[PDB]
Amino acid sequence: LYYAYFEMAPSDLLVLTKMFKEQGFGSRQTNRLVDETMDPFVDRIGYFSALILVEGMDIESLHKCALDDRRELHQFAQDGLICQDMDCLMLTFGDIPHHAPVLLAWALLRHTLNPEETSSVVRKIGGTAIQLNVFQYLTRLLQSLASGGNDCTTSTACMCVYGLLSFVLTSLTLGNQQDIIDTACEVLADPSLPELFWGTEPTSGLGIILDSVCGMFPHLLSPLLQLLRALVSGKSTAKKVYSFLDKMSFYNELYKHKPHDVISHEDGTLWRRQTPKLLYPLGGQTNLRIPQGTVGQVMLDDRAYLVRWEYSYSSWTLFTCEIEMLLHVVSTADVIQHCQRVKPIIDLVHKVISTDLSIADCLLPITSRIYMLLQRLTTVISPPVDVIASCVNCLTVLAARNPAKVWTDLRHTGFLPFVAH
Amino acid sequence: VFGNLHQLGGVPGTYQLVRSFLNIKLPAPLPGLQDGEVEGHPVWALIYYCMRCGDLLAASQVVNRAQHQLGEFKTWFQEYMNSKDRRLSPATENKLRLHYRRALRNNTDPYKRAVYCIIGRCDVTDNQSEVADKT
Known part of the structure; x- marks a missing residue:
C-alpha cells in the first residue's frame, strides 16, 4: 500500500532485493512441504512478492528514464552498485x-541497457521467463488478486502486472501474440462482479493492444469483444467504450472475392477502394451495405484474402444482424458463423445492457432474437451450454427494462415448463 | 544475341540483349517456374543479370519501372548506385538488413534474394541458393 504512494527510494529498493536474496523470495516452504491449511496462503504470498518487486523495479518508469525522463525522484538505476546487487x-x-515476472521485467531493463552495452544473458532470462509460463502464472496471480484476496489491494496491485505487459509488447520484448493478449485480458478481467472504484492505465496499451484488437475484429472475434466486456462493467467511462460500440470506425472481415478497385502507392496489396457491397446477400431487405469509395486494406496476404474496412458501423446493430442470420441460414453472410463467438457476443450484449441499465431502452438490438436463439440453442453440449448461460444473462439484464416481456417469454420458455403435465 | 532470332525484334539496347539471354537462353526449356513475372518477364532475374553484366544503372531503372511492393529496397538500390557503389549511408542499411532477415531471408524468389543479398551485403554467411550457375 505504501509503495503505491511514491516511487521507491533507492535505499528502499535495495533493501527489498537484499531481503529477497536472503529469503530466496520466500519460495521454499512447507505447503500441502506439509499441511493443507497453509496451501491456500502460497499463491497470495507469491503474488505480493511478485507485485512488490515489480513495483519497486517500476519497469515502465525506469525504461522511460533510460530513454530519458525528467525527474523529481531519485532512482536506483543511478547507482551502479545497487544494480550489481539486484x-x-x-x-x-x-x-x-515464482519471480518469473520479475525475471521478465528485469530482462527488459537489462535489455534497455543493451543498446548502451551488451546483453547476452538477458535474452536467455527473457526466454526462460516466457517458457516459464510467466503469462499463465500472471493470470493465476491475477485471479488471486481478482475480487477475492482483497478488493483494494488487488487492482492497485494488478496495475503492476499491467505495466510489465505494456513494455513486453514492443519486440518479437514480445509481439502481439495469443499469450500476451490472453494474459492481459485476464489481468483486466481479474474475475470480478461489477463494482467501480479504480481503473487501469492508458494509451501505450491502447494503441498496441486495445486498438490492435479492434483492428482484427470481427475477424478475430474473441479479443475485442472480451476486452470491451470487461472494461464496460468496471469503468465508469461507459461513454467512451459504449460510443465505440455504437460508432465503430473499422470493420475487419474475410474478403469476398475479386472485383473492387484498388488505388496505388507502393506495391499495394494493402490499399484498395470499393464499389458497393452487401455484407448480407438476399435474405431480407435489412442488409449491411457499404457505400463505394470506402477504403480497405488487405492485411494478411497470407492464406487468406483478409481485408480491413474503413466502413464505420454500429457493433451492436451489426451483431444483432449476424446472429439472426445464423438461425435462418436463409440469408448468406460474409461474416462467417461460429458458436464460440456466440458465447462472448451475447455476454457482451448482456454486460453492456446491464451496465448501461438506466439508459437501457436505447440499448437493445437483440430482444426477440435472443429468445429464439435460446429455444433453438438448447443442447446437451458444453460449448453451446456456455452459450445458453449467455442467453439467460441477457434475459436477466433485459428484465429491468422490459419486465413484462421476460415473463411472457418464460411462460413458454422450454427449460422451465413443468406445468404441462 | 548476335546470331539469328527475332535479329531480335527490338533495338539492340543492352536491356533487351539481357531479356533475350534470360528468355531465349536457359531460363526456359519451354518456359516456367518460380520466378516473379510481369508481362512475360522475370524482373528480378533481369535486375540480377543486368547487375551481373555491370549495367547497374539499367538495373536500377528496371526496378524503378518494376511494379513491386518491397519499394523501400528500391530506395536502397538508388544511392548504392549513386555512390562509389559502396552505398554507405550512416542511415538506413540497418533497416534494410532487418527486413531481409525477417521477410526475405526465409522464403522468396531466388533472384530477388540475390539482389537483396548482394546489394545489401545482408547476410555475410555466403552463398546464393538457386542461381549460382557458374564458377
Missing part, C-alpha cells in the same frame, strides 16, 4: 519459477 539476486532467481 542483478545477482534476480539472476539466481532465474532458476526458479
Whole structure:
C-alpha cells in the first residue's frame, strides 16, 4: 500500500532485493512441504512478492528514464552498485519459477541497457521467463488478486502486472501474440462482479493492444469483444467504450472475392477502394451495405484474402444482424458463423445492457432474437451450454427494462415448463 | 544475341540483349517456374543479370519501372548506385538488413534474394541458393 504512494527510494529498493536474496523470495516452504491449511496462503504470498518487486523495479518508469525522463525522484538505476546487487539476486532467481515476472521485467531493463552495452544473458532470462509460463502464472496471480484476496489491494496491485505487459509488447520484448493478449485480458478481467472504484492505465496499451484488437475484429472475434466486456462493467467511462460500440470506425472481415478497385502507392496489396457491397446477400431487405469509395486494406496476404474496412458501423446493430442470420441460414453472410463467438457476443450484449441499465431502452438490438436463439440453442453440449448461460444473462439484464416481456417469454420458455403435465 | 532470332525484334539496347539471354537462353526449356513475372518477364532475374553484366544503372531503372511492393529496397538500390557503389549511408542499411532477415531471408524468389543479398551485403554467411550457375 505504501509503495503505491511514491516511487521507491533507492535505499528502499535495495533493501527489498537484499531481503529477497536472503529469503530466496520466500519460495521454499512447507505447503500441502506439509499441511493443507497453509496451501491456500502460497499463491497470495507469491503474488505480493511478485507485485512488490515489480513495483519497486517500476519497469515502465525506469525504461522511460533510460530513454530519458525528467525527474523529481531519485532512482536506483543511478547507482551502479545497487544494480550489481539486484542483478545477482534476480539472476539466481532465474532458476526458479515464482519471480518469473520479475525475471521478465528485469530482462527488459537489462535489455534497455543493451543498446548502451551488451546483453547476452538477458535474452536467455527473457526466454526462460516466457517458457516459464510467466503469462499463465500472471493470470493465476491475477485471479488471486481478482475480487477475492482483497478488493483494494488487488487492482492497485494488478496495475503492476499491467505495466510489465505494456513494455513486453514492443519486440518479437514480445509481439502481439495469443499469450500476451490472453494474459492481459485476464489481468483486466481479474474475475470480478461489477463494482467501480479504480481503473487501469492508458494509451501505450491502447494503441498496441486495445486498438490492435479492434483492428482484427470481427475477424478475430474473441479479443475485442472480451476486452470491451470487461472494461464496460468496471469503468465508469461507459461513454467512451459504449460510443465505440455504437460508432465503430473499422470493420475487419474475410474478403469476398475479386472485383473492387484498388488505388496505388507502393506495391499495394494493402490499399484498395470499393464499389458497393452487401455484407448480407438476399435474405431480407435489412442488409449491411457499404457505400463505394470506402477504403480497405488487405492485411494478411497470407492464406487468406483478409481485408480491413474503413466502413464505420454500429457493433451492436451489426451483431444483432449476424446472429439472426445464423438461425435462418436463409440469408448468406460474409461474416462467417461460429458458436464460440456466440458465447462472448451475447455476454457482451448482456454486460453492456446491464451496465448501461438506466439508459437501457436505447440499448437493445437483440430482444426477440435472443429468445429464439435460446429455444433453438438448447443442447446437451458444453460449448453451446456456455452459450445458453449467455442467453439467460441477457434475459436477466433485459428484465429491468422490459419486465413484462421476460415473463411472457418464460411462460413458454422450454427449460422451465413443468406445468404441462 | 548476335546470331539469328527475332535479329531480335527490338533495338539492340543492352536491356533487351539481357531479356533475350534470360528468355531465349536457359531460363526456359519451354518456359516456367518460380520466378516473379510481369508481362512475360522475370524482373528480378533481369535486375540480377543486368547487375551481373555491370549495367547497374539499367538495373536500377528496371526496378524503378518494376511494379513491386518491397519499394523501400528500391530506395536502397538508388544511392548504392549513386555512390562509389559502396552505398554507405550512416542511415538506413540497418533497416534494410532487418527486413531481409525477417521477410526475405526465409522464403522468396531466388533472384530477388540475390539482389537483396548482394546489394545489401545482408547476410555475410555466403552463398546464393538457386542461381549460382557458374564458377
